[PDB]
Amino acid sequence: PRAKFTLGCLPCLGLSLVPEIATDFYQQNSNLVMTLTAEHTETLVKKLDLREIDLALTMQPVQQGDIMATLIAEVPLVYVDKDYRQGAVEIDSIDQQRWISPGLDSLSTAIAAHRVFPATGLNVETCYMAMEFVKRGVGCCITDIFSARHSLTPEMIHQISPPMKIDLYLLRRADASLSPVTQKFVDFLCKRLRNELREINLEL
Amino acid sequence: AKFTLGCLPCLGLSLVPEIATDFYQQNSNLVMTLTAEHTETLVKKLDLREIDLALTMQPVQQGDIMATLIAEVPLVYVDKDYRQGAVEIDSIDQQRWISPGLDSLSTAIAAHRVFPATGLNVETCYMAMEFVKRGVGCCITDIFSARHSLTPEMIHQISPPMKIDLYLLRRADASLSPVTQKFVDFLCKRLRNELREINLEL
Numbered sequence: 001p002r003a004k005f006t007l008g009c010l011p012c013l014g015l016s017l018v019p020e021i022a023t024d025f026y027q028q029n030s031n032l033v034m035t036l037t038a039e040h041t042e043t044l045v046k047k048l049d050l051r052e053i054d055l056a057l058t059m060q061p062v063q064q065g066d067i068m069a070t071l072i073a074e075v076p077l078v079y080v081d082k083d084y085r086q087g088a089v090e091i092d093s094i095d096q097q098r099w100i101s102p103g104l105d106s107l108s109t110a111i112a113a114h115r116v117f118p119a120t121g122l123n124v125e126t127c128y129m130a131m132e133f134v135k136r137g138v139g140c141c142i143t144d145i146f147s148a149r150h151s152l153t154p155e156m157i158h159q160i161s162p163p164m165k166i167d168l169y170l171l172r173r174a175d176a177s178l179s180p181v182t183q184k185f186v187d188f189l190c191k192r193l194r195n196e197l198r199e200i201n202l203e204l
Numbered sequence: 205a206k207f208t209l210g211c212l213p214c215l216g217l218s219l220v221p222e223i224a225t226d227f228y229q230q231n232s233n234l235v236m237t238l239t240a241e242h243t244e245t246l247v248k249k250l251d252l253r254e255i256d257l258a259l260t261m262q263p264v265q266q267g268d269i270m271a272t273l274i275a276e277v278p279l280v281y282v283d284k285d286y287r288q289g290a291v292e293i294d295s296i297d298q299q300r301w302i303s304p305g306l307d308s309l310s311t312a313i314a315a316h317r318v319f320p321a322t323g324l325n326v327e328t329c330y331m332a333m334e335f336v337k338r339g340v341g342c343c344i345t346d347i348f349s350a351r352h353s354l355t356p357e358m359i360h361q362i363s364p365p366m367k368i369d370l371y372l373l374r375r376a377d378a379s380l381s382p383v384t385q386k387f388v389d390f391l392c393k394r395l396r397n398e399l400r401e402i403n404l405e406l
């Protein structure tokens with residue numbers, strides 16, 4: 001029974017993870033009207049208010065209007081740099097003269113819990129844009145594991161000490177209801193996201 | 205000099221960071237902020253002076269926005285199935301079409317062929333490219349999102365060649381510093397020179 005739903009997600013989730021999961025679902029159920037888009041948190045919330053999307057994946061809880069925030073799992077953060085010293089990295093050991101300031105508030109807030117970095121020359125509000133600067137040796141960053149895995153060779157990806165994490169949320173309007181097929185997708189999405197993150201977290 | 209440049213996702217995957225890198229190695233006297241957004245959002249943030257510059261594939265003259273035509277971006281057909289070689293728009297399997305939503309890319313495609321409603325709609329370039337990589341469907345996309353995400357045998361020229369225009373947007377009532385305008389000139393030159401070289405390869 002053909003159901004129509006729109007999923008919006010953060011850019012770091014749209015690079016590979018969400019397309020992979022949507023693919024696995026699309027193959028075992030083709031009669032669908034599936035719309036996917038990647039947006040920043042603020043846009044995701046407004047498009048949810050305006051019923052332009054039905055589901056949003058963020059790293060921030062929200063309780064405005066009728067939006068229900070469901071905690072799916074915890075996303076590990078990693079230090080990324082074009083340097084060939086391997087092993088974990090303490091946040092206090094990071095060279096602040098090469099720091100690229102992130103734009104993800106949750107990422108920033110989590111980093112600010114352990115260290116506040118001063119104003120710098122490069123500020124990058126989109127994960128894959130920051131990763132390209134790291135790839136070219138321009139600077140270093142702390143990012144989610146997904147944007148690091150997708151864009152960087154493993155020699156550039158380092159665990160942080162102490163471990164750092166941020167929460168992954170599925171946002172959904174309460175009063176806007178979903179079809180039976182759509183709720184099946186939501187369950188599948190949440191289980192897959194939790195299982196993948198369960199593994200990744202154990203690897204770190 | 206502090207300025208914020210917004211750009212489309214396909215331009216942020218590698219092109220704009222490369223050019224910003226080459227500029228920021230030769231000029232450290234600057235506070236550069238970079239973000240990737242959809243056209244709609246880029247325009248609003250430009251209206252509200254939240255960003256100073258936007259790279260789009262669409263002219264805009266609403267409000268105070270001035271559009272500068274930089275270059276033409278070649279469009280390509282992407283599909284892991286279709287064997288290597290150029291592809292006519294009429295020969296496209298519309299059963300496996302991934303709709304790019306509603307933007308300038310779609311309008312440009314609609315000028316030559318209208319594709320019916322389909323099961324997969326993907327409003328973000330790199331998300332569509334991942335579906336192509338997994339064999340799920342095919343698309344027409346800009347060369348940058350195809351080069352960055354796909355191996356070359358998945359990237360096909362279109363017949364007849366299709367292109368879409370690249371624009372730098374700027375508010376008219378927005379004065380920018382000397383260093384910032386130097387970056388703008390460098391950015392426009394590099395974007396044209398790179399596109400000139402890509403277009404000759406196609």
Ligand SMILES: O=C(O)C(=O)Cc1c[nH]c2ccccc12
Binds near residue numbers: 010012103104
């Ligand atoms: O805006 C994006 O691309 C995001 O998904 C948030 C984000 C995740 N990791 C980052 C690293 C640097 C800047 C933004 C992000």
Ligand SMILES: O=C(O)C(=O)Cc1c[nH]c2ccccc12
Binds near residue numbers: 242326328343344349
């Ligand atoms: O850069 C983006 O993500 C855009 O909005 C434009 C776009 C370029 N190539 C595409 C392929 C599928 C959907 C949108 C685009």
Ligand SMILES: [Mg+2]
Binds near residue numbers: 038
């Ligand atoms: Mg994006």
